[PDB]
Amino acid sequence: GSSGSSGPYNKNGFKVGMKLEGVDPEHQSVYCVLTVAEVCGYRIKLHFDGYSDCYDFWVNADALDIHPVGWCEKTGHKLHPPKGYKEEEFNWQTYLKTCKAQAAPKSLFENQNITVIPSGFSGPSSG
C-alpha cells in the first residue's frame, strides 16, 4: 500500500512446505512431483522428492506446466512417482498425512483457466 510502511513485495505467493507437480527438463510430457525448497523474486525453487537438492531448478511463479496436487488426475494424465516410487504405490494423501503437509493452493495457479461456454451447445457426461 502506498500509504504506510513503504516496502512493496516481490514474491508471487508460494511458500516453503507446499507440494506441487512440475515438468522435467528431459521431457515436456513427463510430470514429476516437487517440493518448495526456496522462494525469491518472481520465481520459486523446485526440488525433486527423493533426488538431491543440487538437482533443483527455478520455475516461473506463473508457469503453466506446474500444477497443484491432484492435478494430473483432474485433467486426465498419469503422474510419475519420485525416485524409487511406483505410480500405484505413491499416494499423495498418504504422503501428505505423514509429512503433515498441505497441497499448494489453487490460488497460486489462478493464471490459466477455461473460458465460459457461449451458452449454445451442451454435451453429455460419459462415465
From Swiss-Prot:
- Primary gene name: L3MBTL3
Q: Per the UniProt entry, what species is this protein from, by scientific name?
A: Homo sapiens
Query: How would you summarize the oligomeric state and partners of this protein?
Result: Interacts with RNF2. Interacts (via SAM domain) with SAMD1 (via SAM domain); the interaction mediates L3MBTL3 binding to chromatin. Interacts with RBPJ; the interaction is required for L3MBTL3 localization to chromatin and is impaired by Notch-derived peptides containing the intracellular domain (NICD). Interacts (via SAM domain) with KDM1A. Interacts with DCAF5. Interacts with DNMT1. Interacts with E2F1. Interacts with SOX2. Interacts with SFMBT1.
**Any idea where this protein resides?**
Nucleus
Coiled-coil ranges from the UniProt annotation: none
Q: Which segments carry the MBT repeats?
A: 8-82
- The name under which this protein is listed is Lethal(3)malignant brain tumor-like protein 3
Protein function: Is a negative regulator of Notch target genes expression, required for RBPJ-mediated transcriptional repression. It recruits KDM1A to Notch-responsive elements and promotes KDM1A-mediated H3K4me demethylation. Involved in the regulation of ubiquitin-dependent degradation of a set of methylated non-histone proteins, including SOX2, DNMT1 and E2F1. It acts as an adapter recruiting the CRL4-DCAF5 E3 ubiquitin ligase complex to methylated target proteins. Required for normal maturation of myeloid progenitor cells.
